[PDB]
């Protein structure tokens, strides 16, 4: 979620990802932990086996074969963590994640009940404004002369500088509001 | 294979701001600054203002508005058995015929 994806997965990434998928599905069939441990070690035997085959034209043919084998022995209903995509708690609290900007419409009589939270907030709104100009400038200075771009972002290279485009990450609502 | 040095340096900086943000969300001791029996008087005023008083109004409505209009309350005729004495006319229902008697 935090890291933007690359342009394309390498062979190394496509095999590790399969490895994790194939174990999680094994655990879905086995259930029992002792039985899940036994077959998880057999699974690693099948991945250590062709670990070094560096043909790079049969390694691929060993992956498409293994994905087509995974897709046939899927669990029709794998276990999912409650907060993960497809999970039962997935996005349960998204109705409680009010953006911080909604406080900017609060009535004064509402703001009068939290005088010290609302004072540590005008500092953050100042810090955000003074930092903005220097953030925009830094992002042009690192705009590579060749258009090739990636979703990643640069840090603060100086002192007294916050990393550019930091407000929507730092201020984001809590995972469990 | 993992974070690049510039990647790892951005996380340090954001993570620093982030935790300084969540700390700011904590409430001071004095917030919010609001502007101002087990079966007795606690349990009397409930069963005497949600059961008794509402029953006076519901009874008043039933007794003088529903039971004084035609066919508003219509009940099944009560079962009458061979042997009963009818509370109105005084009639007595004749007893039944006679059973040959049985035992399982």
């Amino acid at each position: 979620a935090f890291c933007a994806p690359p342009a394309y997965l390498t062979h190394q990434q496509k095999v590790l990802r399969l490895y994790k998928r194939a174990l999680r599905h094994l655990e879905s069939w086995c259930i029992h932990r002792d039985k899940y441990r036994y077959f998880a070690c057999l699974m690693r035997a099948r991945f250590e086996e062709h670990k070094n085959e560096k043909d790079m034209m049969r390694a691929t043919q060993l992956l498409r074969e293994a994905e087509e084998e995974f897709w046939q022995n899927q669990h029709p209903q794998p276990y999912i963590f409650p907060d993960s995509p497809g999970g039962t708690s997935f996005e349960r609290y998204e109705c409680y994640k009010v953006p911080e900007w909604c406080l900017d419409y609060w009535h004064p009589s509402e703001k009068a009940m939290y005088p010290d939270y609302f004072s540590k907030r005008e500092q953050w709104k100042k810090l955000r404004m003074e930092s903005w100009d220097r953030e925009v400038k830094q992002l042009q200075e690192e705009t590579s002369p060749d258009g090739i771009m990636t979703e990643a972002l640069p840090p603060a290279r100086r002192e007294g500088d916050l990393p550019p485009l930091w407000w929507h990450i730092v201020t984001r609502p809590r995972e469990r509001p | 294979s993992g974070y690049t040095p510039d990647e790892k340096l951005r996380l340090q900086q954001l993570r620093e701001l982030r935790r300084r943000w969540l700390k700011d969300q904590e409430l001071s001791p004095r917030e919010p600054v609001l502007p101002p029996v087990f079966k007795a008087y606690r349990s009397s005023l409930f069963a005497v203002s949600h059961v008794l008083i509402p029953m006076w109004f519901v009874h008043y409505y039933v007794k003088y508005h529903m039971a004084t209009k035609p066919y508003t309350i219509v009940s099944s005729k009560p079962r009458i058995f061979p042997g009963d004495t009818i509370l109105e006319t005084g009639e007595v229902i004749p007893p039944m015929r006679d059973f040959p008697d049985q035992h399982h």
């Binding site: 009010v98 009535h107 509402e110 939290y114 939270y117 609502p173 509001p177 | 409430l27």
Partner: peptide
């Protein structure tokens, strides 16, 4: 610790 809860302006 008690945390602040961001809410919409309910005053209105």
């Amino acid at each position: 610790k008690r945390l602040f809860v961001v809410k919409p302006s309910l005053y209105y």
